[PDB]
mmCIF file of all heavy atoms in Angstrom:
data_model
loop_
_atom_site.group_PDB
_atom_site.id
_atom_site.type_symbol
_atom_site.label_atom_id
_atom_site.label_comp_id
_atom_site.label_asym_id
_atom_site.label_seq_id
_atom_site.Cartn_x
_atom_site.Cartn_y
_atom_site.Cartn_z
ATOM 1 N N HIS U 32 84.638 64.815 -7.801
ATOM 2 C CA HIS U 32 85.379 64.923 -6.514
ATOM 3 C C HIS U 32 85.539 66.402 -6.172
ATOM 4 O O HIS U 32 85.953 67.181 -7.031
ATOM 5 C CB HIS U 32 86.733 64.199 -6.601
ATOM 6 C CG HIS U 32 87.417 64.026 -5.285
ATOM 7 N ND1 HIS U 32 88.385 64.899 -4.831
ATOM 8 C CD2 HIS U 32 87.272 63.088 -4.323
ATOM 9 C CE1 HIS U 32 88.809 64.505 -3.648
ATOM 10 N NE2 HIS U 32 88.143 63.396 -3.314
ATOM 11 N N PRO U 33 85.224 66.841 -4.930
ATOM 12 C CA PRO U 33 85.153 68.270 -4.612
ATOM 13 C C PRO U 33 86.515 68.974 -4.711
ATOM 14 O O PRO U 33 86.543 70.135 -5.080
ATOM 15 C CB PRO U 33 84.632 68.293 -3.167
ATOM 16 C CG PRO U 33 85.102 66.975 -2.593
ATOM 17 C CD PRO U 33 84.979 66.002 -3.746
ATOM 18 N N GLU U 34 87.596 68.256 -4.387
ATOM 19 C CA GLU U 34 88.993 68.760 -4.456
ATOM 20 C C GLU U 34 89.429 68.810 -5.924
ATOM 21 O O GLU U 34 89.758 69.914 -6.399
ATOM 22 C CB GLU U 34 89.918 67.873 -3.619
ATOM 23 C CG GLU U 34 91.269 68.504 -3.328
ATOM 24 C CD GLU U 34 92.106 67.814 -2.260
ATOM 25 O OE1 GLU U 34 91.619 66.845 -1.639
ATOM 26 O OE2 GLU U 34 93.252 68.252 -2.051
ATOM 27 N N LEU U 35 89.397 67.662 -6.608
ATOM 28 C CA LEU U 35 89.872 67.489 -8.007
ATOM 29 C C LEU U 35 88.656 67.545 -8.942
ATOM 30 O O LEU U 35 88.069 66.487 -9.232
ATOM 31 C CB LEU U 35 90.652 66.167 -8.097
ATOM 32 C CG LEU U 35 91.833 66.126 -9.071
ATOM 33 C CD1 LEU U 35 91.363 66.052 -10.514
ATOM 34 C CD2 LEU U 35 92.774 67.311 -8.881
ATOM 35 N N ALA U 36 88.281 68.761 -9.359
ATOM 36 C CA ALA U 36 87.120 69.070 -10.231
ATOM 37 C C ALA U 36 87.579 69.400 -11.661
ATOM 38 O O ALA U 36 86.820 69.067 -12.595
ATOM 39 C CB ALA U 36 86.326 70.207 -9.633
ATOM 40 N N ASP U 37 88.750 70.038 -11.821
ATOM 41 C CA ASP U 37 89.347 70.451 -13.126
ATOM 42 C C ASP U 37 89.367 69.251 -14.080
ATOM 43 O O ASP U 37 88.583 69.258 -15.051
ATOM 44 C CB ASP U 37 90.757 71.032 -12.952
ATOM 45 C CG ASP U 37 90.806 72.418 -12.330
ATOM 46 O OD1 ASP U 37 90.000 73.278 -12.740
ATOM 47 O OD2 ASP U 37 91.657 72.629 -11.444
ATOM 48 N N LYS U 38 90.225 68.263 -13.805
ATOM 49 C CA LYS U 38 90.211 66.935 -14.474
ATOM 50 C C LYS U 38 89.039 66.152 -13.877
ATOM 51 O O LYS U 38 89.115 65.812 -12.680
ATOM 52 C CB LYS U 38 91.548 66.211 -14.282
ATOM 53 C CG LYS U 38 92.775 66.955 -14.794
ATOM 54 C CD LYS U 38 94.085 66.302 -14.403
ATOM 55 C CE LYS U 38 95.289 66.913 -15.089
ATOM 56 N NZ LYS U 38 95.547 68.299 -14.634
ATOM 57 N N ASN U 39 87.987 65.914 -14.667
ATOM 58 C CA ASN U 39 86.669 65.413 -14.188
ATOM 59 C C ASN U 39 86.816 63.965 -13.701
ATOM 60 O O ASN U 39 86.419 63.049 -14.448
ATOM 61 C CB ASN U 39 85.590 65.549 -15.268
ATOM 62 C CG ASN U 39 85.298 66.988 -15.639
ATOM 63 O OD1 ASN U 39 85.169 67.849 -14.769
ATOM 64 N ND2 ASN U 39 85.180 67.260 -16.928
ATOM 65 N N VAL U 40 87.363 63.783 -12.493
ATOM 66 C CA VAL U 40 87.514 62.456 -11.817
ATOM 67 C C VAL U 40 86.230 62.185 -11.032
ATOM 68 O O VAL U 40 85.854 62.978 -10.171
ATOM 69 C CB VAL U 40 88.776 62.354 -10.926
ATOM 70 C CG1 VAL U 40 90.047 62.358 -11.757
ATOM 71 C CG2 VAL U 40 88.864 63.415 -9.837
ATOM 72 N N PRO U 41 85.479 61.097 -11.335
ATOM 73 C CA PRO U 41 84.363 60.676 -10.487
ATOM 74 C C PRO U 41 84.834 60.209 -9.099
ATOM 75 O O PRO U 41 85.985 59.823 -8.954
ATOM 76 C CB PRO U 41 83.693 59.537 -11.277
ATOM 77 C CG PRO U 41 84.188 59.718 -12.695
ATOM 78 C CD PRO U 41 85.593 60.256 -12.538
ATOM 79 N N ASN U 42 83.927 60.263 -8.117
ATOM 80 C CA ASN U 42 84.227 60.062 -6.674
ATOM 81 C C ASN U 42 84.474 58.573 -6.393
ATOM 82 O O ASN U 42 85.238 58.282 -5.458
ATOM 83 C CB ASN U 42 83.117 60.657 -5.796
ATOM 84 C CG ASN U 42 83.510 60.863 -4.347
ATOM 85 O OD1 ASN U 42 84.675 60.749 -3.979
ATOM 86 N ND2 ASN U 42 82.536 61.182 -3.510
ATOM 87 N N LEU U 43 83.863 57.660 -7.160
ATOM 88 C CA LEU U 43 84.013 56.191 -6.945
ATOM 89 C C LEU U 43 85.369 55.715 -7.482
ATOM 90 O O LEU U 43 85.942 54.802 -6.863
ATOM 91 C CB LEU U 43 82.819 55.421 -7.533
ATOM 92 C CG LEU U 43 82.776 55.167 -9.044
ATOM 93 C CD1 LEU U 43 82.119 53.825 -9.349
ATOM 94 C CD2 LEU U 43 82.050 56.286 -9.784
ATOM 95 N N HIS U 44 85.874 56.327 -8.561
ATOM 96 C CA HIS U 44 87.244 56.094 -9.100
ATOM 97 C C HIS U 44 88.273 56.353 -7.994
ATOM 98 O O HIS U 44 89.220 55.555 -7.872
ATOM 99 C CB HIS U 44 87.515 56.965 -10.337
ATOM 100 C CG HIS U 44 86.734 56.570 -11.547
ATOM 101 N ND1 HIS U 44 87.081 56.984 -12.817
ATOM 102 C CD2 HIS U 44 85.639 55.792 -11.691
ATOM 103 C CE1 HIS U 44 86.225 56.488 -13.690
ATOM 104 N NE2 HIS U 44 85.332 55.751 -13.024
ATOM 105 N N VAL U 45 88.058 57.414 -7.207
ATOM 106 C CA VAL U 45 88.933 57.844 -6.074
ATOM 107 C C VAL U 45 88.971 56.717 -5.037
ATOM 108 O O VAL U 45 90.079 56.283 -4.671
ATOM 109 C CB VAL U 45 88.435 59.158 -5.441
ATOM 110 C CG1 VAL U 45 89.250 59.546 -4.215
ATOM 111 C CG2 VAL U 45 88.396 60.307 -6.440
ATOM 112 N N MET U 46 87.792 56.267 -4.599
ATOM 113 C CA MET U 46 87.613 55.251 -3.528
ATOM 114 C C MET U 46 88.267 53.928 -3.943
ATOM 115 O O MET U 46 88.976 53.339 -3.102
ATOM 116 C CB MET U 46 86.126 55.025 -3.236
ATOM 117 C CG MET U 46 85.459 56.236 -2.617
ATOM 118 S SD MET U 46 83.805 55.889 -1.984
ATOM 119 C CE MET U 46 82.875 55.777 -3.510
ATOM 120 N N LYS U 47 88.057 53.498 -5.192
ATOM 121 C CA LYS U 47 88.527 52.183 -5.712
ATOM 122 C C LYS U 47 90.033 52.232 -6.001
ATOM 123 O O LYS U 47 90.715 51.233 -5.691
ATOM 124 C CB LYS U 47 87.708 51.768 -6.939
ATOM 125 C CG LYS U 47 86.207 51.629 -6.704
ATOM 126 C CD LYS U 47 85.810 50.770 -5.508
ATOM 127 C CE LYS U 47 84.390 51.016 -5.049
ATOM 128 N NZ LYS U 47 84.162 50.488 -3.684
ATOM 129 N N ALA U 48 90.532 53.340 -6.560
ATOM 130 C CA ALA U 48 91.975 53.584 -6.805
ATOM 131 C C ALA U 48 92.737 53.640 -5.476
ATOM 132 O O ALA U 48 93.929 53.281 -5.477
ATOM 133 C CB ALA U 48 92.173 54.858 -7.587
ATOM 134 N N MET U 49 92.082 54.095 -4.403
ATOM 135 C CA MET U 49 92.689 54.224 -3.051
ATOM 136 C C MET U 49 92.608 52.888 -2.300
ATOM 137 O O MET U 49 93.594 52.556 -1.607
ATOM 138 C CB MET U 49 92.006 55.325 -2.231
ATOM 139 C CG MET U 49 92.446 56.733 -2.600
ATOM 140 S SD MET U 49 94.211 57.027 -2.313
ATOM 141 C CE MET U 49 94.807 57.007 -4.002
ATOM 142 N N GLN U 50 91.495 52.153 -2.417
ATOM 143 C CA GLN U 50 91.312 50.841 -1.726
ATOM 144 C C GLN U 50 92.243 49.804 -2.371
ATOM 145 O O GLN U 50 92.603 48.831 -1.677
ATOM 146 C CB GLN U 50 89.838 50.412 -1.696
ATOM 147 C CG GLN U 50 89.366 49.604 -2.900
ATOM 148 C CD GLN U 50 87.937 49.139 -2.755
ATOM 149 O OE1 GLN U 50 87.126 49.760 -2.072
ATOM 150 N NE2 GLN U 50 87.617 48.030 -3.402
ATOM 151 N N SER U 51 92.612 50.005 -3.643
ATOM 152 C CA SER U 51 93.646 49.215 -4.364
ATOM 153 C C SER U 51 94.981 49.325 -3.615
ATOM 154 O O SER U 51 95.598 48.275 -3.358
ATOM 155 C CB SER U 51 93.778 49.650 -5.808
ATOM 156 O OG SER U 51 94.527 50.850 -5.920
ATOM 157 N N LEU U 52 95.386 50.549 -3.258
ATOM 158 C CA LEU U 52 96.638 50.835 -2.503
ATOM 159 C C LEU U 52 96.499 50.324 -1.062
ATOM 160 O O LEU U 52 97.516 49.863 -0.508
ATOM 161 C CB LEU U 52 96.933 52.340 -2.533
ATOM 162 C CG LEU U 52 97.065 52.981 -3.915
ATOM 163 C CD1 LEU U 52 97.521 54.427 -3.787
ATOM 164 C CD2 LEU U 52 98.015 52.197 -4.807
ATOM 165 N N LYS U 53 95.294 50.394 -0.484
ATOM 166 C CA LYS U 53 94.991 49.904 0.890
ATOM 167 C C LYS U 53 95.182 48.382 0.952
ATOM 168 O O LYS U 53 95.822 47.918 1.920
ATOM 169 C CB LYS U 53 93.567 50.279 1.317
ATOM 170 C CG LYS U 53 93.215 49.950 2.766
ATOM 171 C CD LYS U 53 91.723 49.897 3.053
ATOM 172 C CE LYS U 53 90.999 48.728 2.410
ATOM 173 N NZ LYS U 53 91.525 47.418 2.865
ATOM 174 N N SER U 54 94.652 47.642 -0.029
ATOM 175 C CA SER U 54 94.643 46.153 -0.063
ATOM 176 C C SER U 54 96.076 45.607 -0.073
ATOM 177 O O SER U 54 96.344 44.656 0.690
ATOM 178 C CB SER U 54 93.852 45.627 -1.230
ATOM 179 O OG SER U 54 94.289 46.212 -2.444
ATOM 180 N N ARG U 55 96.955 46.192 -0.899
ATOM 181 C CA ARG U 55 98.399 45.825 -0.982
ATOM 182 C C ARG U 55 99.241 46.791 -0.128
ATOM 183 O O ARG U 55 100.473 46.824 -0.324
ATOM 184 C CB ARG U 55 98.862 45.724 -2.443
ATOM 185 C CG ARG U 55 98.857 47.018 -3.248
ATOM 186 C CD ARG U 55 99.259 46.724 -4.683
ATOM 187 N NE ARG U 55 99.230 47.882 -5.571
ATOM 188 C CZ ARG U 55 98.158 48.357 -6.206
ATOM 189 N NH1 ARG U 55 96.969 47.792 -6.060
ATOM 190 N NH2 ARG U 55 98.280 49.417 -6.990
ATOM 191 N N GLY U 56 98.599 47.541 0.777
ATOM 192 C CA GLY U 56 99.200 48.112 2.001
ATOM 193 C C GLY U 56 100.164 49.257 1.735
ATOM 194 O O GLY U 56 101.122 49.399 2.520
ATOM 195 N N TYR U 57 99.917 50.056 0.694
ATOM 196 C CA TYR U 57 100.726 51.252 0.334
ATOM 197 C C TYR U 57 100.197 52.486 1.078
ATOM 198 O O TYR U 57 100.965 53.458 1.216
ATOM 199 C CB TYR U 57 100.715 51.503 -1.177
ATOM 200 C CG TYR U 57 101.336 50.440 -2.057
ATOM 201 C CD1 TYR U 57 101.300 50.575 -3.436
ATOM 202 C CD2 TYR U 57 101.982 49.321 -1.542
ATOM 203 C CE1 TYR U 57 101.863 49.629 -4.279
ATOM 204 C CE2 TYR U 57 102.544 48.361 -2.373
ATOM 205 C CZ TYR U 57 102.489 48.516 -3.748
ATOM 206 O OH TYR U 57 103.042 47.579 -4.573
ATOM 207 N N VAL U 58 98.940 52.451 1.535
ATOM 208 C CA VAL U 58 98.223 53.619 2.131
ATOM 209 C C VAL U 58 97.490 53.170 3.406
ATOM 210 O O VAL U 58 97.016 52.015 3.446
ATOM 211 C CB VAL U 58 97.282 54.258 1.089
ATOM 212 C CG1 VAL U 58 95.980 53.487 0.908
ATOM 213 C CG2 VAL U 58 97.002 55.718 1.401
ATOM 214 N N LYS U 59 97.419 54.055 4.406
ATOM 215 C CA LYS U 59 96.733 53.828 5.708
ATOM 216 C C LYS U 59 95.275 54.294 5.584
ATOM 217 O O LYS U 59 95.048 55.370 5.000
ATOM 218 C CB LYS U 59 97.486 54.561 6.826
ATOM 219 C CG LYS U 59 96.924 54.405 8.234
ATOM 220 C CD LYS U 59 97.788 55.067 9.295
ATOM 221 C CE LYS U 59 97.083 55.264 10.623
ATOM 222 N NZ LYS U 59 96.998 54.000 11.394
ATOM 223 N N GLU U 60 94.337 53.506 6.123
ATOM 224 C CA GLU U 60 92.866 53.721 6.040
ATOM 225 C C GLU U 60 92.381 54.373 7.342
ATOM 226 O O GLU U 60 92.891 54.001 8.418
ATOM 227 C CB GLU U 60 92.173 52.377 5.786
ATOM 228 C CG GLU U 60 90.647 52.413 5.757
ATOM 229 C CD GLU U 60 90.023 52.900 4.458
ATOM 230 O OE1 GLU U 60 90.522 53.891 3.906
ATOM 231 O OE2 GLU U 60 89.037 52.286 4.007
ATOM 232 N N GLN U 61 91.434 55.311 7.235
ATOM 233 C CA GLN U 61 90.568 55.756 8.361
ATOM 234 C C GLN U 61 89.207 56.190 7.808
ATOM 235 O O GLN U 61 89.160 56.633 6.637
ATOM 236 C CB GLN U 61 91.248 56.868 9.162
ATOM 237 C CG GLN U 61 90.833 56.885 10.625
ATOM 238 C CD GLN U 61 91.052 55.542 11.280
ATOM 239 O OE1 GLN U 61 90.160 54.978 11.905
ATOM 240 N NE2 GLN U 61 92.240 54.988 11.100
ATOM 241 N N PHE U 62 88.147 56.059 8.615
ATOM 242 C CA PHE U 62 86.743 56.333 8.204
ATOM 243 C C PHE U 62 85.916 56.862 9.382
ATOM 244 O O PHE U 62 85.713 56.110 10.351
ATOM 245 C CB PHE U 62 86.121 55.064 7.620
ATOM 246 C CG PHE U 62 84.823 55.305 6.896
ATOM 247 C CD1 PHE U 62 84.801 55.998 5.694
ATOM 248 C CD2 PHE U 62 83.620 54.855 7.416
ATOM 249 C CE1 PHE U 62 83.608 56.226 5.026
ATOM 250 C CE2 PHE U 62 82.427 55.081 6.744
ATOM 251 C CZ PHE U 62 82.422 55.764 5.551
ATOM 252 N N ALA U 63 85.430 58.103 9.276
ATOM 253 C CA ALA U 63 84.575 58.787 10.277
ATOM 254 C C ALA U 63 83.249 59.191 9.620
ATOM 255 O O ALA U 63 83.275 60.019 8.684
ATOM 256 C CB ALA U 63 85.292 59.986 10.850
ATOM 257 N N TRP U 64 82.145 58.604 10.094
ATOM 258 C CA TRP U 64 80.742 58.959 9.744
ATOM 259 C C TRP U 64 80.443 58.564 8.290
ATOM 260 O O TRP U 64 79.776 57.527 8.098
ATOM 261 C CB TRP U 64 80.461 60.446 10.024
ATOM 262 C CG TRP U 64 80.420 60.827 11.474
ATOM 263 C CD1 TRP U 64 80.832 60.088 12.549
ATOM 264 C CD2 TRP U 64 79.954 62.077 12.016
ATOM 265 N NE1 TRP U 64 80.633 60.782 13.711
ATOM 266 C CE2 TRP U 64 80.102 62.005 13.416
ATOM 267 C CE3 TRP U 64 79.411 63.241 11.456
ATOM 268 C CZ2 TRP U 64 79.737 63.052 14.262
ATOM 269 C CZ3 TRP U 64 79.052 64.277 12.289
ATOM 270 C CH2 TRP U 64 79.215 64.182 13.673
ATOM 271 N N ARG U 65 80.895 59.361 7.314
ATOM 272 C CA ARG U 65 80.676 59.116 5.860
ATOM 273 C C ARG U 65 81.923 59.434 5.026
ATOM 274 O O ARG U 65 81.819 59.325 3.792
ATOM 275 C CB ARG U 65 79.510 59.972 5.361
ATOM 276 C CG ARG U 65 78.174 59.616 5.991
ATOM 277 C CD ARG U 65 77.028 60.304 5.281
ATOM 278 N NE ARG U 65 76.735 59.692 3.992
ATOM 279 C CZ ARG U 65 75.742 60.053 3.178
ATOM 280 N NH1 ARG U 65 74.924 61.043 3.509
ATOM 281 N NH2 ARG U 65 75.572 59.422 2.028
ATOM 282 N N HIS U 66 83.057 59.779 5.647
ATOM 283 C CA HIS U 66 84.261 60.308 4.955
ATOM 284 C C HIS U 66 85.443 59.349 5.127
ATOM 285 O O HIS U 66 85.785 59.039 6.283
ATOM 286 C CB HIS U 66 84.584 61.713 5.468
ATOM 287 C CG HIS U 66 83.760 62.773 4.826
ATOM 288 N ND1 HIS U 66 84.174 63.440 3.691
ATOM 289 C CD2 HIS U 66 82.548 63.270 5.142
ATOM 290 C CE1 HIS U 66 83.256 64.316 3.343
ATOM 291 N NE2 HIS U 66 82.247 64.231 4.215
ATOM 292 N N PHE U 67 86.032 58.903 4.012
ATOM 293 C CA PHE U 67 87.327 58.176 3.962
ATOM 294 C C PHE U 67 88.457 59.188 4.164
ATOM 295 O O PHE U 67 88.370 60.301 3.609
ATOM 296 C CB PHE U 67 87.521 57.459 2.624
ATOM 297 C CG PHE U 67 86.553 56.337 2.335
ATOM 298 C CD1 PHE U 67 85.390 56.565 1.612
ATOM 299 C CD2 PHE U 67 86.825 55.041 2.752
ATOM 300 C CE1 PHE U 67 84.512 55.528 1.332
ATOM 301 C CE2 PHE U 67 85.947 54.004 2.465
ATOM 302 C CZ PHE U 67 84.792 54.249 1.756
ATOM 303 N N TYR U 68 89.471 58.802 4.940
ATOM 304 C CA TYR U 68 90.746 59.544 5.115
ATOM 305 C C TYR U 68 91.919 58.582 4.882
ATOM 306 O O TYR U 68 92.072 57.622 5.671
ATOM 307 C CB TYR U 68 90.844 60.156 6.514
ATOM 308 C CG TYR U 68 89.663 60.967 6.983
ATOM 309 C CD1 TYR U 68 88.594 60.358 7.617
ATOM 310 C CD2 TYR U 68 89.637 62.347 6.861
ATOM 311 C CE1 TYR U 68 87.520 61.096 8.091
ATOM 312 C CE2 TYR U 68 88.571 63.101 7.327
ATOM 313 C CZ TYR U 68 87.507 62.472 7.947
ATOM 314 O OH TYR U 68 86.448 63.199 8.414
ATOM 315 N N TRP U 69 92.720 58.840 3.841
ATOM 316 C CA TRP U 69 93.874 58.001 3.425
ATOM 317 C C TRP U 69 95.186 58.735 3.715
ATOM 318 O O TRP U 69 95.305 59.905 3.300
ATOM 319 C CB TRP U 69 93.760 57.644 1.944
ATOM 320 C CG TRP U 69 92.661 56.677 1.641
ATOM 321 C CD1 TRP U 69 92.630 55.347 1.942
ATOM 322 C CD2 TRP U 69 91.432 56.962 0.951
ATOM 323 N NE1 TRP U 69 91.467 54.786 1.486
ATOM 324 C CE2 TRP U 69 90.708 55.753 0.885
ATOM 325 C CE3 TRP U 69 90.872 58.117 0.392
ATOM 326 C CZ2 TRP U 69 89.460 55.667 0.268
ATOM 327 C CZ3 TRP U 69 89.637 58.033 -0.208
ATOM 328 C CH2 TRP U 69 88.940 56.823 -0.269
ATOM 329 N N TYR U 70 96.128 58.057 4.381
ATOM 330 C CA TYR U 70 97.504 58.549 4.659
ATOM 331 C C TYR U 70 98.520 57.706 3.885
ATOM 332 O O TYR U 70 98.526 56.467 4.048
ATOM 333 C CB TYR U 70 97.825 58.504 6.154
ATOM 334 C CG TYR U 70 96.800 59.156 7.042
ATOM 335 C CD1 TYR U 70 96.564 58.674 8.317
ATOM 336 C CD2 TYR U 70 96.085 60.268 6.623
ATOM 337 C CE1 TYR U 70 95.630 59.269 9.147
ATOM 338 C CE2 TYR U 70 95.145 60.873 7.440
ATOM 339 C CZ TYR U 70 94.919 60.371 8.707
ATOM 340 O OH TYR U 70 94.007 60.954 9.531
ATOM 341 N N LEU U 71 99.357 58.370 3.086
ATOM 342 C CA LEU U 71 100.440 57.729 2.297
ATOM 343 C C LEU U 71 101.546 57.268 3.255
ATOM 344 O O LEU U 71 101.952 58.078 4.113
ATOM 345 C CB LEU U 71 100.968 58.735 1.268
ATOM 346 C CG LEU U 71 102.027 58.201 0.306
ATOM 347 C CD1 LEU U 71 101.538 56.949 -0.408
ATOM 348 C CD2 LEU U 71 102.433 59.270 -0.697
ATOM 349 N N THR U 72 101.993 56.013 3.111
ATOM 350 C CA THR U 72 103.084 55.381 3.907
ATOM 351 C C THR U 72 104.313 55.168 3.011
ATOM 352 O O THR U 72 104.152 55.181 1.774
ATOM 353 C CB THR U 72 102.597 54.084 4.564
ATOM 354 O OG1 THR U 72 102.127 53.202 3.543
ATOM 355 C CG2 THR U 72 101.497 54.320 5.577
ATOM 356 N N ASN U 73 105.479 54.937 3.629
ATOM 357 C CA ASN U 73 106.836 55.100 3.033
ATOM 358 C C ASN U 73 107.007 54.261 1.760
ATOM 359 O O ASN U 73 107.544 54.803 0.778
ATOM 360 C CB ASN U 73 107.943 54.747 4.031
ATOM 361 C CG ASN U 73 108.065 55.738 5.170
ATOM 362 O OD1 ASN U 73 107.892 56.941 4.980
ATOM 363 N ND2 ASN U 73 108.373 55.245 6.358
ATOM 364 N N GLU U 74 106.605 52.987 1.779
ATOM 365 C CA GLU U 74 106.737 52.073 0.609
ATOM 366 C C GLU U 74 105.755 52.505 -0.489
ATOM 367 O O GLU U 74 106.086 52.322 -1.678
ATOM 368 C CB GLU U 74 106.537 50.616 1.034
ATOM 369 C CG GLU U 74 106.913 49.613 -0.047
ATOM 370 C CD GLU U 74 105.755 49.140 -0.911
ATOM 371 O OE1 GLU U 74 104.805 48.569 -0.342
ATOM 372 O OE2 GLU U 74 105.805 49.345 -2.141
#
């Protein structure tokens, strides 16, 4: 992952860990061209 490189997190772990929060509605989804954008919500 280009942001989190120190702790070697693969890019698919990011997407799946985030879509987990999306499915049970903890995070807001957006997608432009090839890039996911996630916004944290109050709950």
Side-chain angles (χ1 to χ4, degrees):
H32 191 264
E34 195 167 356
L35 214 286
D37 287 315
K38 302 171 171 68
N39 296 315
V40 292
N42 197 10
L43 79 146
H44 290 197
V45 175
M46 293 191 286
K47 301 309 161 197
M49 282 298 106
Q50 88 176 27
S51 78
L52 303 187
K53 186 199 69 60
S54 53
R55 66 183 177 276
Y57 296 177
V58 79
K59 181 175 164 77
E60 177 80 317
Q61 209 54 232
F62 193 69
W64 290 13
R65 296 191 75 177
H66 279 268
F67 295 94
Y68 309 87
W69 290 288
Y70 309 148
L71 184 54
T72 58
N73 291 323
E74 191 265 300

